[PDB]
């Protein structure tokens, strides 16, 4: 459910339409009692303004904190503090297992709200430790994970998702599995591995019905953006376009649906202006990516690939119009992209052929073998050197 908060963060990250989301972002810490925490979440947003608060500036677009946001925070910590103490007292009276862990979570929330991040993490470990069912242990990891995802600090997210996945078969906490599927996909977007996200998301929709987690419909929409970015058309074709998920929702999909339709129609002018549209509505609406530069390279390389894959020759004009990006730009990107060999092409600009060496040929299979092969020799030498003396 708190997945909305991540959508607020994301849109300002690329500096375009930031203005409205900045305000909406600010409102969430009042409720929570998160004043201090906000500065930390602000960090994730980076490459745009997020600095102004009641305790800071009021000059830039990002929204001022209320006098009320501050006061609510004072209330919340007092109240949290009161709950923690109260919860322990009740624990002495009755069962040890359930009651005590609930108490430690109160302590972690209290430290997490004032801003003592280190303090919150030692407390959170305590929670995990205490003897209760595995099912109950999972419930406690999901809150910290969401919080972790917000800051986009990598370490926190790794730990939680990884243990959470183990427990499912062993406990038999299949019921928890539903929240978890969505949670695995969040992790998967969060590292610079959009590849994983594309396979992960598609699975997530079919196995999900409901058990205390964000709507079904929201995921499907999100599935399309990951699916396209990572996957090439034959994989994409089977999975989403023939598959159930995208069709059932129908509405609220047009940016993404326009992409799939255009790609089917195979008129590349139409696909490229929809690339841009799905980049602005969907892709920038995610905070996710520990280096944004990787996200941009993958969307351009994918679209490029489709155009080049279909044709061994194109005239330069058809290719250049289809992209809609500059001579300077096309060239500038192309030099980086070719090295990888996902494109594997070259531009005969003076006769006007866009030739493709073919990423399905002998030239390709060689490029990979050699590239891996040479580096392996250097490695045998480093191992060999240690062993003799």
């Amino acid at each position: 459910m708190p997945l909305e908060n991540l959508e607020e963060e994301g849109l300002p990250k690329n500096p375009d339409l930031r203005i409205a989301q900045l305000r909406f972002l600010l409102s969430l810490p009042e409720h929570r009692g998160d004043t201090a925490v906000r500065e930390e979440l602000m960090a994730a947003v980076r490459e745009n303004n997020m600095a102004p608060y009641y305790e800071a500036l009021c000059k830039s677009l990002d929204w001022q904190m209320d006098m009320d946001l501050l006061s609510k925070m004072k209330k919340a910590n007092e109240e949290e503090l009161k709950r923690l103490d109260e919860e322990l007292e009740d624990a002495e009276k009755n069962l040890g297992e359930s009651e005590i862990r609930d108490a430690m979570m109160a302590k972690a929330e209290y430290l997490c709200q004032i801003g003592d991040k280190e303090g919150a993490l030692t407390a959170f470990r305590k929670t995990y430790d205490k003897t209760v069912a595995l099912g109950h242990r999972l419930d406690i990891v999901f809150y910290l994970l969401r919080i972790g995802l917000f800051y986009m600090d990598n370490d926190l997210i790794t730990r939680n998702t990884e243990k959470a996945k183990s427990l499912i078969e062993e406990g038999g906490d299949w019921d928890r599995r539903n929240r978890l599927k969505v949670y695995q996909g969040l992790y998967c977007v969060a590292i610079r591995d959009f590849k994983q996200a594309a396979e992960l998301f598609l699975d997530t929709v079919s196995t999900f019905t409901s058990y205390e987690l964000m709507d079904y419909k929201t995921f499907v929409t999100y599935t399309v953006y990951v699916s396209m970015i990572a996957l090439e058309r034959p994989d994409l074709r089977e999975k989403v376009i023939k598959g159930a998920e995208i069709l059932e929702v129908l509405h609220s999909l047009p940016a993404v649906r326009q992409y799939l339709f255009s790609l089917y129609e195979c008129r590349y002018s139409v696909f490229f202006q929809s690339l841009a549209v799905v980049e602005q509505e969907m892709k920038k609406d995610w905070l996710f990516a520990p280096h944004y530069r990787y996200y941009v390279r993958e969307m351009r390389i994918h679209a490029y690939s489709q155009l080049l894959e279909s044709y061994r020759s194109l005239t330069l004009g058809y290719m250049a119009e289809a992209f809609g990006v500059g001579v300077e730009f096309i060239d500038q990107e192309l030099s980086r992209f070719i090295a990888a060999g996902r494109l594997h092409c070259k531009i005969d600009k003076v006769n006007e052929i866009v030739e493709t060496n073919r990423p399905d040929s002998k030239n390709w299979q060689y490029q990979e073998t050699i590239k891996k092969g040479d580096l392996l020799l250097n490695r045998v030498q480093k191992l060999s050197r240690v062993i003799n003396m």
């Binding site: 530069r293 250049a320 119009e321 992209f323 500059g326 730009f329 500038q332 990107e333």
Partner: peptide, 24 residues
């Protein structure tokens, strides 16, 4: 070093809308 692609993001979206008309 740092990828020129990032700087390219803002510039590439806008280019697309104009370019298609400008050149065939």
């Amino acid at each position: 070093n740092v990828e020129d692609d990032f700087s390219n993001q803002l510039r590439a979206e806008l280019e697309k809308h104009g370019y298609k008309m400008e050149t065939s």
